[PDB]
Enzyme design. Structure first.
Site, mmCIF file in Angstrom:
data_model
loop_
_atom_site.group_PDB
_atom_site.id
_atom_site.type_symbol
_atom_site.label_atom_id
_atom_site.label_comp_id
_atom_site.label_asym_id
_atom_site.label_seq_id
_atom_site.Cartn_x
_atom_site.Cartn_y
_atom_site.Cartn_z
ATOM 1 N N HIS A 127 7.317 5.046 -12.430
ATOM 2 C CA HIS A 127 7.786 6.411 -12.240
ATOM 3 C C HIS A 127 7.557 7.285 -13.470
ATOM 4 O O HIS A 127 7.188 8.457 -13.337
ATOM 5 C CB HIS A 127 9.274 6.399 -11.872
ATOM 6 C CG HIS A 127 9.554 5.907 -10.481
ATOM 7 N ND1 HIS A 127 10.246 6.656 -9.552
ATOM 8 C CD2 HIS A 127 9.225 4.750 -9.858
ATOM 9 C CE1 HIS A 127 10.337 5.978 -8.419
ATOM 10 N NE2 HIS A 127 9.722 4.820 -8.578
ATOM 11 N N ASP A 139 12.155 13.329 -9.201
ATOM 12 C CA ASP A 139 11.841 12.024 -8.620
ATOM 13 C C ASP A 139 12.219 11.961 -7.137
ATOM 14 O O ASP A 139 13.216 12.539 -6.705
ATOM 15 C CB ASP A 139 12.580 10.931 -9.400
ATOM 16 C CG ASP A 139 12.014 9.536 -9.164
ATOM 17 O OD1 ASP A 139 12.309 8.922 -8.116
ATOM 18 O OD2 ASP A 139 11.276 9.050 -10.043
ATOM 19 N N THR A 199 5.788 9.030 -5.984
ATOM 20 C CA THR A 199 5.019 8.176 -6.881
ATOM 21 C C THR A 199 4.317 7.017 -6.176
ATOM 22 O O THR A 199 3.657 6.220 -6.846
ATOM 23 C CB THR A 199 5.907 7.646 -8.024
ATOM 24 O OG1 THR A 199 7.136 7.121 -7.502
ATOM 25 C CG2 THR A 199 6.221 8.768 -9.017
ATOM 26 N N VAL A 251 0.264 -4.547 -22.420
ATOM 27 C CA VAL A 251 -1.135 -4.265 -22.720
ATOM 28 C C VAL A 251 -1.475 -2.841 -22.295
ATOM 29 O O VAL A 251 -0.746 -2.184 -21.544
ATOM 30 C CB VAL A 251 -2.110 -5.262 -22.052
ATOM 31 C CG1 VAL A 251 -1.728 -6.703 -22.363
ATOM 32 C CG2 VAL A 251 -2.186 -5.015 -20.544
ATOM 33 N N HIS A 306 -0.949 -6.709 -7.920
ATOM 34 C CA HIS A 306 0.131 -6.670 -6.934
ATOM 35 C C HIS A 306 0.062 -5.438 -6.042
ATOM 36 O O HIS A 306 0.837 -5.348 -5.081
ATOM 37 C CB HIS A 306 1.508 -6.745 -7.622
ATOM 38 C CG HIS A 306 1.935 -5.489 -8.328
ATOM 39 N ND1 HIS A 306 1.124 -4.800 -9.205
ATOM 40 C CD2 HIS A 306 3.118 -4.826 -8.318
ATOM 41 C CE1 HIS A 306 1.776 -3.752 -9.680
ATOM 42 N NE2 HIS A 306 2.993 -3.750 -9.163
ATOM 43 N N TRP A 323 1.297 1.252 -6.867
ATOM 44 C CA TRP A 323 0.425 2.387 -6.559
ATOM 45 C C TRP A 323 -0.305 2.917 -7.794
ATOM 46 O O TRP A 323 -1.483 3.277 -7.702
ATOM 47 C CB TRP A 323 1.199 3.515 -5.866
ATOM 48 C CG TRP A 323 0.246 4.574 -5.332
ATOM 49 C CD1 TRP A 323 0.175 5.889 -5.712
ATOM 50 C CD2 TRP A 323 -0.799 4.382 -4.362
ATOM 51 N NE1 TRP A 323 -0.837 6.528 -5.021
ATOM 52 C CE2 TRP A 323 -1.447 5.625 -4.188
ATOM 53 C CE3 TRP A 323 -1.242 3.280 -3.614
ATOM 54 C CZ2 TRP A 323 -2.521 5.798 -3.305
ATOM 55 C CZ3 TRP A 323 -2.310 3.451 -2.738
ATOM 56 C CH2 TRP A 323 -2.933 4.706 -2.590
ATOM 57 N N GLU A 369 -5.472 3.679 -10.709
ATOM 58 C CA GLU A 369 -6.224 3.403 -11.933
ATOM 59 C C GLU A 369 -7.496 2.610 -11.638
ATOM 60 O O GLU A 369 -8.567 2.916 -12.178
ATOM 61 C CB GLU A 369 -5.339 2.650 -12.932
ATOM 62 C CG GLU A 369 -4.304 3.516 -13.632
ATOM 63 C CD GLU A 369 -3.073 2.743 -14.089
ATOM 64 O OE1 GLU A 369 -2.063 3.400 -14.439
ATOM 65 O OE2 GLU A 369 -3.099 1.488 -14.087
ATOM 66 N N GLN A 402 4.028 -2.864 -1.249
ATOM 67 C CA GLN A 402 2.748 -3.338 -1.778
ATOM 68 C C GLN A 402 1.809 -3.852 -0.686
ATOM 69 O O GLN A 402 0.585 -3.780 -0.853
ATOM 70 C CB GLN A 402 3.012 -4.407 -2.842
ATOM 71 C CG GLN A 402 3.568 -3.814 -4.136
ATOM 72 C CD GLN A 402 4.497 -4.740 -4.915
ATOM 73 O OE1 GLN A 402 4.317 -5.957 -4.935
ATOM 74 N NE2 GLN A 402 5.484 -4.150 -5.597
#
Ligand code: E7F
Ligand code: UDP
Ligand code: UDP
Length: 453
Positions: free
Chosen positions: A21, A110, A133, A333, A350, A353, A358, A375
């Site tokens: 989020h 949100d 989101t 990372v 997984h 979103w 990305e 998912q």
């Protein structure tokens, strides 16, 4: 006949819990700042995770012109608990928002905060919006929930969800987010209280684009899903920003052949059970491919307490160090720097979103391993576009033990498939069209800016 300062478009933003989020809200903030907006960011504190804390710090240092409003919260899944805490305390925000200078122009908050923030936004007298989101396909489900919940057999007799015209035409019961079939759950309660109030919003922003959800976007804006829905603006893909960066991983990637590495990550807030986790490593070794595996042993990063060698076990650690093909880390990372590296040829994900969008931006094909929530719907949004695949028999995390043998076979199947790369490259091409002049995101932001002026 006048030399005057141009009036400022002032936007206020309110993200809720988790990196899934916070990250899209801050990428939206960067987009708005580049349109010469003034931005106020409301920050609920303290954050559940350290990663959220650190990202906010890097954002504010990069953009000192942003006005931070502190939101100190009073003292189950730790992120779901924070969702409930922010929602239950949001009624207190009115004094901080009504005294903002320069005059507020718009308010974007949100999706989990619709009910307590609607009367606050009405009192402010500005146009107000949610930033949704997740996928536009999942937003159609959210909007359709009152149509399904009116039935007297809900949720016991519901085998297919078939929303007219959307990107996933038939969602089976096994793909419905489990809390939505439980009336007393947090998200089941929020869906029933908030979805009937969507018609009071000025609009809905979604991090998506026509290249991956053409049908859902057209159905939502054509009155097909629910009559009287507010307009839905496809403002994605959100491009990763400089402030997100925090060097041995990049140095290791530099020494691998192009397209030879499989990146593995299950997001910022999910940890597999220890036995299932060890089967993942067995599958990576058996696949024979180079890999970069991001591990979590706890849902919340602050709670990590055991070393990676104890999590993985002697036998698995010995196998991986001997073959010298993989890198395993248990830390935060720079996922976008990894997905953008030329060595990375595939993504075991997984299908959260932000991770999907990305991978689309960087044209990386996906082996989907959906674990919870929405998912499985997102994995099928990808599969419908032909740039990833998922195994519907693996099921929600913990229902069965997926074995290393079948994990390794699935990795080889995706990495040998050049058709997946062909479709992923076309998605990457459409991702750049969406942000260029005439693209869906450019057109939507211009509409919004003109209204706010
Ligand atoms: O329907 C959704 C999203 C839409 C929505 C709308 C209103 C609302 O009030 C709440 C949700 C959803 C779900 O039904 C279950 C679930 O478990 C998650 C998961 O949400 C967590 C958050 O912590 C993410 O981290 C994770 O990636 C994601 O899958 C969901 O997004
Ligand atoms: O070690 C990590 C883990 C996650 N991410 C980022 O965290 C976000 C995860 O959000 P997503 O919607 O994919 O799933 P969630 O974590 O909410 O389940 C994405 O922006 C990832 O790029 C990252 O940069 N490094
Ligand atoms: O992305 C997610 C969503 C949920 N959960 C956890 O998994 C539980 C069950 O989620 P479900 O499978 O029912 O969806 C939740 O209560 C959370 O603790 C998780 O680890 N990651």
């Amino acid at each position: 006949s006048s030399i005057a300062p141009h009036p400022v478009v002032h936007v206020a933003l309110l993200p809720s819990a988790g990196m899934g989020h916070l990250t899209p809200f801050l990428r939206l903030a960067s987009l708005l700042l580049h349109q010469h907006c003034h931005v106020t960011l409301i920050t609920p504190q303290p954050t559940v995770s350290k990663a959220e804390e650190d990202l906010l710090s890097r954002f504010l240092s990069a953009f000192p012109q942003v006005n931070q409003l502190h939101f100190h919260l009073p003292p189950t899944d730790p992120f779901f608990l924070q969702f409930a805490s922010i929602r239950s305390s949001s009624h207190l925000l009115t004094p901080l928002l009504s005294s903002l200078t320069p005059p507020l122009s718009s308010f974007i908050y949100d999706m989990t905060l619709i009910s307590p923030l609607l009367p606050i936004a009405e009192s402010l007298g500005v146009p107000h919006y949610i930033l949704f989101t997740s996928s536009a396909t999942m937003f159609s489900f959210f909007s359709y929930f009152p149509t399904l919940a009116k039935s007297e057999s809900f949720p016991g007799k519901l085998d297919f969800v078939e929303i007219p015209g959307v990107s996933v035409s038939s969602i089976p019961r096994s793909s419905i987010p489990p809390p939505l079939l439980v009336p007393n759950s947090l998200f089941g309660k929020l869906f029933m209280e908030d979805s009937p109030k969507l018609k009071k919003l000025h609009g809905v922003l979604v991090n998506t684009f026509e290249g991956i959800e053409k049908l859902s976007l057209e159905a939502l804006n054509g009155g097909k899903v629910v009559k009287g829905l507010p307009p839905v603006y496809g403002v994605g893909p959100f491009v990763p920003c400089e402030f997100e960066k925090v060097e041995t991983i990049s140095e290791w990637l530099d020494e691998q052949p192009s397209g030879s590495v499989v990146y593995v990550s299950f997001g910022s807030r999910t940890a597999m059970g220890r036995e299932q986790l060890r089967e993942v490593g067995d599958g990576l070794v058996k696949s024979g491919w180079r890999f970069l595996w991001v591990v979590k042993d706890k849902i919340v990063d602050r709670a990590e307490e055991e070393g990676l060698d104890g999590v993985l076990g002697f036998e698995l650690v010995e196998r991986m160090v001997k073959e010298k093909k993989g890198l395993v880390v248990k830390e935060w990372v720079d996922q976008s720097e990894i997905l953008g590296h030329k060595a990375v040829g595939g993504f075991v994900s997984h299908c959260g979103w932000n991770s999907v969008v990305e991978a689309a931006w960087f044209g990386v094909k996906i082996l989907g391993w959906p674990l919870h929530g929405d998912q499985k719907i997102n994995a099928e949004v990808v599969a419908k576009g032909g740039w990833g695949v998922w195994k519907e028999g693996w099921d929600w995390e913990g229902e069965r033990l997926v074995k290393g043998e079948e994990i390794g076979e699935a990795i080889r199947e995706v990495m040998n498939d050049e058709s997946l790369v062909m479709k992923a490259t076309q998605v990457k091409k459409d991702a750049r069209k969406a942000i260029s002049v005439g693209g869906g995101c450019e057109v939507a932001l211009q509409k919004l800016m003109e209204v706010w002026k």
